[PDB]
């Protein structure tokens, strides 16, 4: 091809990280407002950045969510992995849920107040998001790179919901890396009670 040293062809491989769905979650991005995590060839989660909300209250009834066991275990594991990875999550009024019937919808409120005064809620939520959808998340948030600590978007809400499997990937190749990246370092940046 390019014949390095006159004797080596430069060749490539691209890995089909789809065959991995049987053992590990794969994430990808649709445009910038939709990010998906699949947990097999049947179901998964949708993560969207929106300027509307579904839940208009402040409750997340986790105790009831576990008293009953109507939810998919892998999907709950992923929600936990995402949630527990948010650094410095001191404001709990920012999180609301509807765990009724086994259905999962979780909202994180990214609204400011104060933006310049970064590092409150939206930053930690969006940083976690960038890892879960890593590689397909770079166009979802504004001001990519620049800083590491003042991550912001035009959207007011991050909403995570349960969905069905469809290919769902148009902006990035499916990859296990986002989930795996948040699998480790699960307990960091945790404030005392």
């Amino acid at each position: 091809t390019s014949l390095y040293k006159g004797v080596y062809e430069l060749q490539t491989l691209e890995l089909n990280m789809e065959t991995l769905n049987m053992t590990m979650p794969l994430s990808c991005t649709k445009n910038n407002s939709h990010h998906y995590i699949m947990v097999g060839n049947e179901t998964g989660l949708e993560l969207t950045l929106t300027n509307t909300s579904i839940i208009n209250h402040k409750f997340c009834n986790l105790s009831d969510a576990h008293k009953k066991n109507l939810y998919d275990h892998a999907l709950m594991s992923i929600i936990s992995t995402f949630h527990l990875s948010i650094p410095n999550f001191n404001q709990y009024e920012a999180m609301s849920c509807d765990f009724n019937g086994g259905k999962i919808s979780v909202q994180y409120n990214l609204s400011h107040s104060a933006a310049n005064h970064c590092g409150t809620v939206a930053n930690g939520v969006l940083q976690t998001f960038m890892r879960m959808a890593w590689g397909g998340s770079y166009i979802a948030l504004d001001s990519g790179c620049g800083n590491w600590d003042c991550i912001m978007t035009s959207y007011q809400y991050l909403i995570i919901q349960n969905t069905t499997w469809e290919d769902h990937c148009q902006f990035s190749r499916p990859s296990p890396i986002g989930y795996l990246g948040l699998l480790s370092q699960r307990t960091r940046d945790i404030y005392i009670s």
Partner: antibody
């Protein structure tokens, strides 16, 4: 293609109690909206509800109105207690949608019921 | 919160003339306004959404635009069938309002 339809009655006192039965297409993808139009007035919003029973209301009706949903029959019923002379209006039930993505975003009510007339005589 | 005001409460042109109905917001509008057409005895019909989208069954006679706090509904030729009442609609997260309503009238 789709048509929303409700029920009600003239109601001199007590509670308004209006009902709306949803057509069979996409109950969970829309915000269910109740609006009102008193004679001589423009349109007023009463409140809105989704399939998770998450609601919002017109603050002036906060103490009197509660909107409920029952997904097992795709039917949501308006509720307005202490109904009075000021509530003598035509009520409508409509399907709404809000495209909260990127920019510009938008909102509208597309499928409308025919209108229920309620008075308090 | 925010409100809408429609200044041209009564507007009168003969059929066939072009006309517009303005609508102003108290704050830069979160989202874009929708317009509804209403008839004396029926139900409101969505005419335009997102300032400029004409939806489906609405004829090309109806168009519009807007941004910021200033929006406008344009009727290209006022067909006699269109001389009724128009309303502005605005939705914020879990809250929405309507304008006062403006009316078209046929004169001779």
């Amino acid at each position: 293609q789709l048509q929303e339809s409700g029920a009600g009655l003239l109601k001199p006192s007590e509670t308004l109690s209006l009902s709306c039965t949803v057509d069979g297409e996409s109950f969970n993808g829309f915000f269910w909206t109740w609006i009102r139009q008193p004679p001589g007035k423009g349109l007023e919003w009463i409140g809105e509800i989704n399939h998770l029973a998450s609601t919002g209301y017109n603050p002036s009706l906060k103490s009197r109105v509660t909107i409920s949903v029952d997904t097992s029959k795709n039917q949501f019923s308006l509720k307005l207690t202490s109904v009075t002379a000021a509530d003598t209006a035509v009520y409508y039930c409509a399907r709404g949608y809000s495209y909260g993505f990127a920019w510009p975003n938008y909102h509208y009510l597309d499928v409308w019921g025919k209108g229920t007339t309620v008075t308090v005589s | 919160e925010t409100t809408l005001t429609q200044s041209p409460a009564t507007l009168s042109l003969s059929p066939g003339e072009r006309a517009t109905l303005s609508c102003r917001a108290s704050q830069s509008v979160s989202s874009y306004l929708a317009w509804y057409q209403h008839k004396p005895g029926q139900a409101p019909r969505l005419l335009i959404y997102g300032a400029s989208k004409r939806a489906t069954g609405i004829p090309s006679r109806f168009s519009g635009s807007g941004s910021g706090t200033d929006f406008s509904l344009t009727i290209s030729s006022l067909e006699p069938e269109d001389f009724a009442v128009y309303y502005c609609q605005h939705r914020s997260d879990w809250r929405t309002t309507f304008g006062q309503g403006t009316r078209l009238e046929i004169k001779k």
